[PDB]
Amino acid sequence: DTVDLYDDRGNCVAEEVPIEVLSPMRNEAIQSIVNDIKRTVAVDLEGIENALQNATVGGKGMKIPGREMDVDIVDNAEAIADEIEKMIRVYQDDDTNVEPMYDGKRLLVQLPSERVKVMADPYSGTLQAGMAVVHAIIDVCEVDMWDANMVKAAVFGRYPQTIDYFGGNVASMLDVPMKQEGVGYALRNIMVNHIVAATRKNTMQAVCLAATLQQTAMFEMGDALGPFERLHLLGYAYQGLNADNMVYDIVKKHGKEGTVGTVVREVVERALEDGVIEVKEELPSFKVYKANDMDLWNAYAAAGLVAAVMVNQGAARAAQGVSATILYYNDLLEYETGLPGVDFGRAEGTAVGFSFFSHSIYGGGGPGIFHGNHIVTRHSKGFAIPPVAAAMALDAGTQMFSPEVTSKLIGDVFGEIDEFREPMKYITEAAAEEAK
Amino acid sequence: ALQNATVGGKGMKIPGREMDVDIVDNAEAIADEIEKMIRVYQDDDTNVEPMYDGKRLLVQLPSERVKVMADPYSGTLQAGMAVVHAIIDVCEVDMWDANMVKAAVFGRYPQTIDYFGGNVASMLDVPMKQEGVGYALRNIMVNHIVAATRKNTMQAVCLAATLQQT
Amino acid sequence: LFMKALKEKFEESPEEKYTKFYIFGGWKQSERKKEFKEWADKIVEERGVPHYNPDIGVPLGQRKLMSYQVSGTDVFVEGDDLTFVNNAAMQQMWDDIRRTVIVGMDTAHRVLERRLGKEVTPETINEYMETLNHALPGGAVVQEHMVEIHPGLTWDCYAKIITGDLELADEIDDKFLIDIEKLFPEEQAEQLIKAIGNRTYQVCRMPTIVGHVCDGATMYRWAAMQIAMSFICAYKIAAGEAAVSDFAFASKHAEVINMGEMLPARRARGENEPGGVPFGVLADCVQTMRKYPDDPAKVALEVIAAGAMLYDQIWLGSYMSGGVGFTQYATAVYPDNILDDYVYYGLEYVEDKYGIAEAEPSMDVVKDVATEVTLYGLEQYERYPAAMETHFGGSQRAAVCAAAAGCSTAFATGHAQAGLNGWYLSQILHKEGQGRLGFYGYALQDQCGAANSLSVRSDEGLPLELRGPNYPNYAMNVGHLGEYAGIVQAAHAARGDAFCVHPVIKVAFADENLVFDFTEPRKEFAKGALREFEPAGERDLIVPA
Amino acid sequence: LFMKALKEKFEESPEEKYTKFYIFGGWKQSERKKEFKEWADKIVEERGVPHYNPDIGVPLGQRKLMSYQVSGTDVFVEGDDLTFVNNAAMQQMWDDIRRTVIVGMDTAHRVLERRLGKEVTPETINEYMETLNHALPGGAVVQEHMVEIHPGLTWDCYAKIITGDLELADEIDDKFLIDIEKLFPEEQAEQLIKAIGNRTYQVCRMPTIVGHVCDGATMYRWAAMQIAMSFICAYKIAAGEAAVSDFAFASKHAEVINMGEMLPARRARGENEPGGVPFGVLADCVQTMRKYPDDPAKVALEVIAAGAMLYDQIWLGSYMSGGVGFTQYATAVYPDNILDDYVYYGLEYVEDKYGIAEAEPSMDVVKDVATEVTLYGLEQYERYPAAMETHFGGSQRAAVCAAAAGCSTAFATGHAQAGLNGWYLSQILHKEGQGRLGFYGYALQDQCGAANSLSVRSDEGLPLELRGPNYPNYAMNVGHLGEYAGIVQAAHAARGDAFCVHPVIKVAFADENLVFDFTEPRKEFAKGALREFEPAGERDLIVPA
Amino acid sequence: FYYPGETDVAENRRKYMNPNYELKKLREIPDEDIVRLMGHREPGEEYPSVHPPLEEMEEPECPIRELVEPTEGAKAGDRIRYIQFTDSVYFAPIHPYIRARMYMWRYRGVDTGSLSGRQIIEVRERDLEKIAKELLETEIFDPARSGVRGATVHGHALRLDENGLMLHALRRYRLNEETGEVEYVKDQVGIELDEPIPVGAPADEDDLKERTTIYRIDGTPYREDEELLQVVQRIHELRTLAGYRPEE
Ligand code: F43
Ligand SMILES: C[C@@H](OP(=O)(O)O)[C@H](NC(=O)CCCCCCS)C(=O)O
Ligand SMILES: O=S(=O)(O)CCS
Ligand SMILES: O=S(=O)(O)CCS
């Protein structure tokens, strides 16, 4: 099985790519993104300064009166960075990278891959990188021994009393292992808004980043395995790596006048023309289509789902009805064909609860705050979250809880890293070389 | 578990859902299917060997699978899901009773947080049982430590110390 | 079956499509809602902050507000008397389950002999139970100057022994024994003894008041503590010695049994909480299989009643949300004998076409039984506009028809998973039939349903017996959970099984010293609806007159 | 201070080392323990399973069984009347904390305008609160045919507004406003307004009965649901529309405040449970800083009383263990004015040597103040064998002396961490003094204590304000937790602070519509001890006469 | 295709879904009275905006944005408002899930929710008023068996008023038998209007059945359409099978 791979502008960038080359354990770029996710941490130096300046530690309205402390963190960001790469480096010639950002308000700390390597907990890099910031502040800013515990709190919040770094000023794409809905859900517990912030509102690149993170958890959970490996390999090529230029071509032609229904019909025609599906039997007026290839049919429908969202929500410039699009793309697509929708029901399944929990009193929220680990959107095996990332990127500003409110730090610091911001070029390039 | 429909563990039995399959006798055939599903390259360190006359089974995943793994316990999902599939289409399990094999392997998961009443084990166990960030390599019983070093005192001390200090 | 109730609730013929509205007096047509304003008035007077107020927002009762015959009974009550907060029996059912922990006695007794050097005999075991029943409610056995708990608050706390070792069973004081042979029909009794084996257990029922102040994960810690105190007392070891830590670990982990297990971070909860309780286990708590072995429908219907109540009204409608809640989401499946009619007829169908529990599990049987009963149930709602007006939400309509369909498919096969697969066929039929299904996120489950039903993957595959409110699809939405328990019970009732998934939990809830009567949940609900049920845990002794 | 009580409890002079035993009639010397057998007898008669029985194991009362003057009062009661299960006030204190959730109103109101296009003004905000106080207790605002909850069961549920925006504050109905300027002394008021800022909050207090049937993590889900229902009603948007999901997310996560956060897997629990509540927060619940601003000792002593009670008796003694429990582990620090004497004298010492809150935090001050007060307290127990016989366990002896030492060191510095460091010096002094410290695992904390106190590492460093029963060292053992809260209060009382760690939680628990009186916890306990306290949540309306 | 089915109701279901099939007009309601029914704004006043127009915004470097044309309200930055319908089980021409399928075929930029007793569409404000007109004056609406309501939606599964109308707890519409027309006296949330808006002329039982989309025993029984019942059973089979094993 060989898919062609195209970029975010519809141009071809790799020829006959065997889909076996696209699995995380075969693909080098994906391998490295996982490494870069365990090692890359964002630290808010301005936020730690404010917290310490006003004794507002632990977060959420708290203030420890009489324990205020005027230290200058931002101004010494450079000096703090230097101490950090001292504590953190393993070899002189490794990939430790600790650079101040935004005039010293922010700080990217990337641990040496040597530290990753021997790390069980994927979030752990935050402890290591954060504890450096803690120590570096104490003996650059000359903090008193009796008030040092205030620096620990400005950095890590209420930890260990809370399960997480509550009210802290440390962040990564991952967050704490005990917040996981199940084994291997680590790479699933990354907000769509985080995804969209780090790809800087580039729709194709958001879809990609969501898809590769999703499908890498699909492999980790033993879902993409055995008689299912192919389902996710092809599902992944078409959804996230713009295989056959199918997502891009559908949107090029349906983008000016099209709806979710016309995109549905676009999917049925193309599978028809390619011998993916045929006519099983002809009822009294209407055709029941069969699948010649169940995995590639799913892959085809899945690609059209992303296109369905891009055309529909892109027309409104509002995220919102991504939940309706996913619901009704699969609803229509089934009763147009007599075949299962994407993910054999689960994709439409997710969108029913998603629609509910984005339009009611009981919970949820707006589209950007969901992720592969939200109980409302955990059900579909990688085929729903990448749509949701397209929608939240196509938003011109209708959301209260946008990437700028929830995912600011991530967007500012991770946005600066290239394989985070633009993972397509890297995965497809990796896939080319890997195929020799 | 499958012979007596005692799945989920802790005294449970689903009556009328008993199922006589022979797992142990086909341990060799099951292993072979497992290294098929699990291998990444022909020349990697996949190792899937039957132990104790087919009663037990060591499944070591290719380091290629580790490499891209966030959850440290996850190898159990991968290795276990292989055992699940390998039993179904070597022992010719009926589609409607296949969910019983999932339960014999992984217990009450996902209803329970862990593989409660399951028959899968590693030195690590599930991330949400951790007392804090990075406590993964800490959540290994002293008895596990001592069992694996076969009651050798110096080597137990060692294994405990290096896991602790790591 | 639903005609008598339909003619009591409605002036018109059940057949008529027309009636009058806006002519009932609004809010104040109802006895209950009047009572509520009276109390609100007295509250605000004494208090100074406004409370309940009819005139805020919506004027209830522009239609006639219904009474409901609790199915299987001849008691008609207002809907307001079936909210769990307004109903003591409903609260006491949950209380009895939450406060139940069962602990293995075998390795404990092994410790006493192999490590502490003390003989374990029936004579000492009885002595031990006299002690445990002093110690469990808060009595002192070892330390001088101990304060104690008022027995008047804890009159519902006690312990008994379950044992499949029949030779030990009739050496234990009858008052300390949950007798399997006395409590059960002959064949259910033998099926249970075989399933339990010569293993012996300690059933502890904590005080309800302790669940009121604390939570479910208190329950086993409390059981473990007093069990260890009683061992110390009865076998005269050191009151604090190495081997005592074996008692702590046997009781709390190695040989323990709780009605529920803990839940993940977003719905963070310890043990013995409603979401950790599996369908098969809730089904084995209900004791209707004991009294009506030859009516698979009553046993299942009765399991639905206390499933929907527990899982929708108390669990989803309070723990997971709160407010006014989900009374009638649950009631749609235990008032008015509507579901009862659908289920019984479905059984008459299976009884004819196939045998009871005689059908090979196959897509063919599901496709047949599921479709037949769903069309039947759909057709009853459009034949009787009265029943349509009773079950006004589609969610509860979908639930009533899918339950009937699901349990019916279980009646034929005797296999929960097949039955479940029929539920998911029924729903997707209802969809295209009325051009609707339920509320907004109603069909998340049911659209994932077909693929996950027989799947074997990670967080996808699992027999229905073993599933619960923590199974990913099932964790959010009403009109599903208790009905699934009904399908588990239906499968196992059709076969004549004594239990669905747990022998010991089954025997434990057969005990006549429980407060709720688990043989007849529906009749109990009406007892609570009429304010005739006497709950435990009330603090009227330690409070002014 | 402890003499009057020591002479009431003991016939002899407090000085005497000798007395008579074995001459009190055993068990039956005590009014309470007699009552308990009476009720046990009636229970077993009706029941058929033995219950409470004096004659099992140990014969209580071979020594005289003590009465206890609740410190600060003139009420003497048996120990049995201060078990939380026997005491309604103690249960109601926990109830009021567990059922409290505070929600930010700012982004919610922003949504209405920026997304839903509706104006938010004081007129609409008051209308909204009339609605919320109909909706919170279970009243219907939008859907027809809604069943409702009995106001008679929920007469303690309500909501009020906290706001540092003083211009909005006196535009809100006084009955909907927790007025910071009315409730607080002038300077505490201004310190609070400054700390809160122009941010406005929604204090919701759920029904106690709901905490009885459910748990703490119910509390906010319930708050969030009815808040969203009331917004829908009052601002006339679609009852189910996109921006409503902003309300769900603001109320449940982004702008929410709970008294406790969730706990890890081994002590798995959701929110608003006792172990998730930090020392500084429990301290800011108690309102004694309001009434006695110029007595740092009373404010701290009062925080110890409701800390030890909550954390030892209810939390550690039930949730985490159970049984007879840990009454007197807690009582050692609120009966008999024993700790009171030690604390006051320690303050007189600090008041002299240093100033109140005037000492630089240093090892020198700890070394001085800690050692002086620990030797004092140790020397009082060996001077008065009567007080030694009162506080018969070493754990409670260590706790009384370490609390006095710890709070005293806090009185000098005004810094919780310094104060805490003095606790850990005091303990290691007690050790070598009497050749003992407490029960077996008493000093796990106190031996880790010195190194973790000022440490800054992962699960080691954290100011005491921010610590709680989930701080690794602190999660297991009695005679520590509530005393730590006292040290947090001591530090902040010495400074004259209005709060220790949370402005909003402080104002919230100042409200006079709470059931428990949080200004005076000790006096309330005696009110519950004498069975004079009227709790909420009782179900006598829905139950036969 | 749209939708399988060999019966009349199935055909009305390809018709309303088909953007080629012209929806037969039964009424004529002026734009001012659509703005008043959806009481979001006053018809004279301009459009409120949730964000500034795209023609003057920092539009992100995105090659997908360039392919997809925004709608009128998107370019102006209009706020997203709604309209909600409740359709009676007694032969209402259009029904919730069928409404949403029509929307996803007919209109651009659609957010919609199909519930049992309510159906809501949410899009840009100016485009919503244009969509609402077609929904209100064509054969898809009927002022007796279909009601406009954004709150207290109770009534779809309820028996009919003496006048043949669906229950309205808030009494939004009234029957003016002087003209024989149904007219709204309140907006869709229940606030009293200044003057009644005649959307009237309720159809008789015969015309409704000829254009109904609900399967009913007293109309076209669900049991009758075997070709629909075969496709829905096919989706069930292939779902259960593929979820077990994709295939081969
Ligand atoms: C405001 C919402 C949005 C939301 O997230 N939840 C609501 C309201 C909420 C409130 C209504 C209480 C009140 O009136 O103040 C409560 C009781 C939850 C709570 N906070 O306690 C509830 N829904 Ni609702 N809700 C219900 C139902 C329904 C059905 C009613 C259809 C009809 O024709 O009447 C529809 C959904 C559907 O169409 O399927 C519905 C919608 C809605 N549901 C629409 C309001 C619809 C309206 O404007 O009238 N509920 C039901 O169908 C049965 C169960 C019933 C619940 C009460 C109970 O179980 O006793 C209640 C359960
Ligand atoms: C989704 C989730 O909510 P959040 O998105 O986390 O705010 C979850 N609520 C629920 O599942 C509520 C379910 C009961 C009410 C809806 C019944 S259909 C919870 O509170 O943990
Ligand atoms: O109207 S909703 O489906 O969102 C809630 C039903 S209670
Ligand atoms: O004796 S122990 O220290 O183990 C327990 C004291 S309650």
Automatic annotation (TrEMBL), chain A:
**Reactions mediated catalytically:** coenzyme B + methyl-coenzyme M = methane + coenzyme M-coenzyme B heterodisulfide
What are the Methyl-coenzyme M reductase beta subunit N-terminal domain coordinates in residue numbering?
Answer: 1-182
Query: What family does the Swiss-Prot or TrEMBL record give for this protein?
Result: Belongs to the methyl-coenzyme M reductase beta subunit family.
Q: Where is the Methyl-coenzyme M reductase beta subunit C-terminal domain?
A: 184-431
Named cofactor requirement(s): coenzyme F430
Q: Which GO terms describe its biological process?
A: methanogenesis
- What is the protein named? Methyl-coenzyme M reductase subunit beta
Q: Which UniProt keywords apply?
A: Methanogenesis, Transferase
UniProtKB/TrEMBL annotation, chain B:
The protein's superkingdom reads Archaea
Q: Domain Methyl-coenzyme M reductase beta subunit N-terminal: where?
A: 1-132
Oligomeric and partner information: MCR is a hexamer of two alpha, two beta, and two gamma chains, forming a dimer of heterotrimers. Hexamer of two alpha, two beta, and two gamma chains.
Q: Which family does it belong to?
A: Belongs to the methyl-coenzyme M reductase beta subunit family.
Output this protein's name: Methyl-coenzyme M reductase subunit beta
Native organism is Methanopyrus kandleri
Phylogenetic lineage: Archaea, Methanobacteriati, Methanobacteriota, Methanomada group, Methanopyri
Encoding gene, per UniProt annotation = mcrB
TrEMBL record, chain E:
Q: Which reaction does it catalyse?
A: coenzyme B + methyl-coenzyme M = methane + coenzyme M-coenzyme B heterodisulfide
What is the name of this protein?
Answer: Methyl-coenzyme M reductase subunit gamma
Among InterPro entries, the record links this protein to:
Me_CoM_Rdtase_Fd-like_fold, Me_CoM_Rdtase_gsu, Me_CoM_Rdtase_gsu_sf
Q: Which residues form a coiled coil?
A: none
Family recorded in the similarity comment:
Belongs to the methyl-coenzyme M reductase gamma subunit family.
Give the Pfam families listed for this entry.
MCR_gamma
EC number(s) given by UniProt: 2.8.4.1
Species this chain originates from: Methanopyrus kandleri
Residues making up the signal peptide according to the UniProt record: none
What's the domain of life for this entry? Archaea
Gene Ontology terms describing biological process: methanogenesis
Cofactor(s) recorded for this entry are: coenzyme F430
Subunit and partners: MCR is a hexamer of two alpha, two beta, and two gamma chains, forming a dimer of heterotrimers.
Q: Which amino acid positions bind coenzyme F430, per UniProt?
A: 116-117, 152-154, 156
Identify the metabolic or biological route this protein is part of: One-carbon metabolism; methyl-coenzyme M reduction; methane from methyl-coenzyme M: step 1/1
Transmembrane region(s): none
